[PDB]
Design a protein around this ligand. Structure first.
Ligand SMILES: COC(=O)[C@H](Cc1ccccc1)OP(=O)(O)[C@H](CC(C)C)NC(=O)[C@H](C)NC(=O)[C@H](C)NC(=O)OCc1ccccc1
Ligand SMILES: *[C@H]1O[C@H](CO)[C@@H](O)[C@H](O)[C@@H]1O
Ligand SMILES: *[C@@H]1OC[C@H](O)[C@H](O)[C@H]1O
Length: 323
C-alpha cells in the first residue's frame, strides 16, 4: 500500500504554498489546490517569453497526447488558463500516478504570467469539476486513491516554515489531541462543510457553509462578518491599493473561531495579520470579503491553524489544532 509525504513551502507572506512534483522526469513547483480539480503546468507550448523563469513540461519528450481534448479554467480571482492534454507519470512525495492527465498550458492570464513562484496547479477537489473536454479526467488523488493505505490526504500549512501534504496516512505528531470529523457535501465538487456558529472577538453569530481551500490565500467571509470583525479593530479602513481592510501593524487583533460539529477551530489574532499591505505602513488583514458569493472560503489564513484531513470515505473532513 502506498503512502508519501510531500513538503510544501510558503512564498513571501505565505501568499501561496508550493510543492515539487515530477512529471515525466522533470520536477516542477506546483501550487496544490483543494478548491479546483485540474492539474495544469507551464509547457513548451507557451510563447517562449512566458516560459521564462519557470520549469516547463515538454509534452513531446514523454507524454501521450489525448487528440482533440482541451481544458479551460477560470478561478475566483479572475485568473484563467487553457490548453491541451497529455497523459504522463506524475510523482508526488514518492507516490506515482501512471497515465495521469496533465493539462499543458497554451494560454495563461496575466496573474500567472507575473508569478514566477509556481509552475502550475495540482487540483485536489473532487474530479466531478475537472474541466477537461470532451471527457473529464481524474485528479492525481482520485487516480492513486485505491493504491493508498487509506483513501485520504492531510495538510499542515504553516506560517513561514515548511509544512506537509501527507498522502494515504495521518501523522498524529502534527496535531494536538484527537481529530474531530464533519460531513462533506461534494455536490459542487468542493470539500464543503458547515459551521454551527462563529465568534469574531466579542461578537458571536449563526452558522454558514464554506469550503476548505488551500489555493486561496485569505479567509473570505460574508461582508456582514467582515464588518463585525473590523468594527473591533481600531482604525481599520478599506484600501483598494492593498486589496481590502488594512490596519496598523502593531494592532491587537481579536481571534476568530468557528464551531464545527462540537469542535471549536480558532484562528489566533496573530495569524490574521497577513503582512505588510505594501500600501505604505499598514498591514493587510487575513479576513476579507467573499464578494457576496453565498459561502465562505476557508483559505490559508484558516488552515495555518489546523491539521486537516481530507477523507474520501464519507466524504468527511477532520480537524485538530496544529502541534
Ligand atoms: C471555481 O473555484 C475556484 O476558483 C476556487 C474556489 C473559490 C471560489 C470562489 C471564490 C474564491 C475561491 O479557487 P482556487 O482554486 O482556490 C483559486 C486558485 C488560484 C491559484 C487562482 N484561488 C482564488 O481564486 C483566490 C481568490 N485567489 C487568491 O487567493 C490569490 C492567489 N491570492 C491572493 O489574492 O492573495 C491575497 C492578496 C491580496 C492583496 C495583496 C496580496 C495578497
Ligand atoms: C506511509 O504508509 C505506507 C503504508 O503503510 C508506508 O509503507 C509508507 O512507508 C509510509 O509510512
Ligand atoms: C519534505 O519532504 C519530506 C519530509 O517530511 C521533510 O520533512 C521535508 O523537508
Amino acid at each position: 500500500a502506498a503512502s508519501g509525504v510531500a513538503t510544501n513551502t510558503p512564498t513571501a507572506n505565505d501568499e501561496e504554498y508550493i510543492t515539487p512534483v515530477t512529471i515525466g522526469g522533470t520536477t516542477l513547483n506546483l501550487n496544490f489546490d483543494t478548491g479546483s480539480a485540474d492539474l495544469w503546468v507551464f509547457s513548451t507550448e507557451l510563447p517562449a517569453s512566458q516560459q521564462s523563469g519557470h520549469s516547463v513540461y515538454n509534452p513531446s519528450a514523454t507524454g501521450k497526447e489525448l487528440s482533440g481534448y482541451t481544458w479551460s479554467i477560470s478561478y475566483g480571482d479572475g485568473s484563467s488558463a487553457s490548453g491541451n492534454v497529455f497523459t504522463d507519470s506524475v510523482t508526488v512525495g514518492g507516490v506515482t500516478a501512471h497515465g495521469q492527465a496533465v493539462q499543458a498550458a497554451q494560454q495563461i492570464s496575466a496573474q500567472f504570467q507575473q508569478d514566477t513562484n509556481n509552475d502550475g496547479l495540482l487540483g485536489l477537489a473532487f474530479s466531478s469539476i475537472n474541466t477537461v473536454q470532451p471527457q473529464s479526467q481524474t485528479t492525481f488523488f482520485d487516480t492513486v486513491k485505491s493504491s493508498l493505505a487509506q483513501p485520504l490526504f492531510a495538510v499542515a500549512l504553516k506560517h513561514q516554515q515548511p509544512g506537509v501534504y501527507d498522502f494515504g496516512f495521518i501523522d498524529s505528531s502534527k496535531y494536538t489531541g484527537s481529530l474531530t470529523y464533519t460531513g462533506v457535501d461534494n455536490s459542487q465538487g468542493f470539500w464543503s462543510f458547515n459551521v454551527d456558529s462563529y465568534t469574531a472577538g466579542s461578537q458571536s453569530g449563526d452558522g454558514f457553509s464554506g469550503i476548505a481551500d488551500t489555493g486561496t490565500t485569505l479567509l473570505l467571509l460574508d461582508d456582514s462578518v467582515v464588518s463585525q470583525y473590523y468594527s473591533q479593530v481600531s482604525g481599520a479602513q478599506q484600501d483598494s491599493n492593498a486589496g481590502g481592510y488594512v490596519f496598523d501593524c502593531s494592532t491587537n487583533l481579536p481571534d476568530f473561531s468557528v464551531s464545527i460539529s462540537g469542535y471549536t477551530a480558532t484562528v489566533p489574532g496573530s495569524l490574521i495579520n497577513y503582512g505588510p499591505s505594501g500600501d505604505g505602513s499598514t498591514c493587510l488583514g487575513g479576513i476579507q470579503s467573499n464578494s457576496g458569493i453565498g459561502f465562505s472560503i476557508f483559505g490559508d489564513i484558516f488552515l495555518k491553524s489546523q491539521y486537516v484531513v481530507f477523507d474520501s470515505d464519507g466524504p468527511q473532513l477532520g480537524f485538530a489544532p496544529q502541534a
